[PDB]
A paper describes a structure:
[name] ([name]) from [name] is one of the enzymes in the molybdenum cofactor (Moco) biosynthesis pathway. Together with MoaA, MoaC is involved in the conversion of guanosine triphosphate (GTP) to precursor Z, the first step in Moco synthesis. The [name] monomer has a common α+β protein fold that is composed of a four stranded anti-parallel β-sheet and three helices, α1, α 2 and α3 located underneath the β-sheet. The fold of MoaC belongs to the ferredoxin like family (βαββαβ) with one additional helix (βααββαβ) not typically present in a prototypical ferredoxin-like molecule.
The asymmetric unit of [name] ([name]) contains a dimer and three such dimers related by crystallographic symmetry associate to form a hexamer, which is the biological assembly. The two independent subunits in the structure superpose onto each other with a root mean square deviation (r.m.s.d) of 0.35 Å for 120 Cα atoms. Upon dimerization, the 4-stranded anti parallel beta sheets of both monomers associate to form a contiguous 8 stranded sheet. The α3 helix is present at the dimer interface of [name], α2 helix, loop region residues 83–89 (LIPLCHQ) and Leu122 and Ile148 are mainly involved in the dimerization of the protein molecule. The α1 helix 48–57, which is not typically present in the ferredoxin fold, shows a higher deviation when superposed with the other existing reported structures and it is not typically present in ferredoxin like fold. This helix lies adjacent to the ligand binding site and may impart functional role. In fact, one of the native crystals soaked in 10 mM GTP diffracted to 2.8 Å, but no GTP could be seen in the electron density map (Data not shown).
Author numbering:
A (entry chain A), C (entry chain A), D (entry chain A): 22 to 29, 35 to 157, 165 to 167
B (entry chain B), E (entry chain B), F (entry chain B): 23 to 157, 163 to 166
The structure:
């Protein structure tokens, strides 16, 4: 029981996901009251780098040259929605890169806050848009 | 604007952490898994291996994570009707807890599952990634 | 005494290599009786990933975007032949990627079985086909 | 407070930098009298590999397929000038790759000699040439 | 033609190393940093994170560097009139000094600063990367 | 479908492993090596450095390999008439044997040799990669 990858213009993919935590934690992330530092900046950077490493992590993904990567945060009362937008010019889509960016930003957020809220959840990681193209 | 926590004045103990997560997919996808009929191959074996390797790569991915000596890593699957539950168990003799590597393994295993199934069910989503247990802490 | 790399369509390279071990070990690999798990699946995945990492490992190799990578096994009585087929579209050949896939699959197989057969050998790693093109 | 990368023919970038050390150390590097081995060969290889890893290291850099990478050394009485020449065909310039090659060669040189000259300095890391193109 | 030094017959002690370096830039660049007006974003936060991660990747980059367990990593900036000083502090409980990781962090943080500012000041340069302190050794 | 072996209930000892391998090439290639006339440069130095670095990257490449603290790594060559023998010696103070890193080093050094010589002799092959010694185990 094994595996095999697939074979071979401008593309875009958007993924999102949610960190669910306490109102205290969300507020510390926003105002930067955490002892470990700025969670949003650290998570943004981690996710951006994780996008580029997708083929390192996910065995059957191809190495693709990404042309731009954005990590955005929408802060609510109890949660933070992470949106990752990835662009490329290659022979295949870039949703995997977007998803991994989302996942690693979320893991990083969690790392920054785990001493304050160890029960924090990472939820609803999904593709929002993909450009064969919907 | 970040400070790694200094673990220098902390003793090494034998630790274990367990994390879980869930891929929400289709009955068809579950079907193709049990039959071994996925286009890309054995999703479960591939994702187990990806989750194990990622556990080790934790400190490379997560900026403020310390480099920890892992003494063991398991990734288990429970396949339901529509869902695939993922459980990662990580063991280490070191200076801080290993819940990050457990979460990373679950996380990369889920991403890898999705890579294997996205052609049959691109609407699948990754849910409920969380710490179950640290050793006493239990959800 | 130093070094320097070379400068700059559709391409394919095939490499093979052989793990030589005991009849007991070959049989455990096939039927999956090993305590560490499925050797073939683990080795296939390791080799596929190693192909993508070739430029990480071999100092003077270029970073190439591979378009497909297959790892195949032919099981005999005493040995396992590993065949790696790599495809790409780039300015240079892909035999190094094929060879490293072969090598790392073989190292992985060995890792899976070393407690059962520590004298197991990795033999006859070679290029079978390269596409300037023979 | 966060970040975001930029979007998207033949290119070249040259960077240099200087290791400043003792006359004794410079001479050992040249004649290869160091216990840890050949410093120039080790540094050349480290820098060449570091060029390829630029996007791994520098968060907002893009993954670019480099087409050639040269690391050269000019040895003086008290110092060693490291010159890195990087070539590519991509949508953006390659000076970051050149700079990182310079930096990691210099760090490696320092690693090779730190037991002999711990006060050794890495100085004047800069872009010499970039090809929008000057 | 190289030999990694054998640290096998050496005891583990609690160690700290400090390294520094300097980015020579423009008053305009300093201005855009204090105002938060750089095109690419927060240079300081980005470079701090890059320096921390690189500290951990030291043995991957530098061929004869041993793999060391880092217990803590700080990257600090002092912004002057025209210059940005970088200081990395590394702590470890291990068999050899941690000055390489400190230098690597300073080094990658400087490269990352330059990446953030090169569009406003491509003539900027990276200067005076050096060991400040090892713990007794002091410059 | 894989389980990393748990080394948690195992003590740390001082260990050494030796592995070997052979590149089967041409008299011409041996000639160009002794004269320093290879197009790509110093094959031996390049491959030694590649073998050392790969030894450290073992647990990144081999899914079920544990992350081990290596205290020393040597790569030696014996150049014969037509062949180049490679020997890797790895030392570590840890919980499991270091034969994988020794084999990986030999392996990547051979691949790197081949990269340096494939333009003169593309028919060269890599042979007889094996464990020689673990410390008592001896082939």
């Amino acid at each position: 029981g094994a595996a095999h990858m697939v074979d071979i213009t401008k593309r875009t993919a958007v993924a999102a996901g949610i960190l669910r935590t306490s109102a205290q934690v969300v507020a510390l992330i926003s105002t930067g009251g955490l002892p470990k530092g700025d969670a949003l900046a650290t998570a943004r950077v981690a996710g951006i780098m994780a996008a580029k490493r997708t083929s390192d992590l996910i065995p059957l993904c191809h190495q693709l040259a990404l042309t731009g990567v954005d990590v955005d945060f929408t802060v609510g009362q109890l949660d933070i929605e992470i949106t990752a937008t990835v662009r490329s010019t290659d022979r295949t889509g870039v949703e995997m890169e977007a998803l991994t960016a989302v996942s690693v930003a979320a893991l990083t957020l969690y790392d920054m806050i785990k001493a304050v809220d160890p029960g924090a959840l990472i939820d609803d990681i999904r593709v929002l848009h993909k450009e064969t193209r919907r």
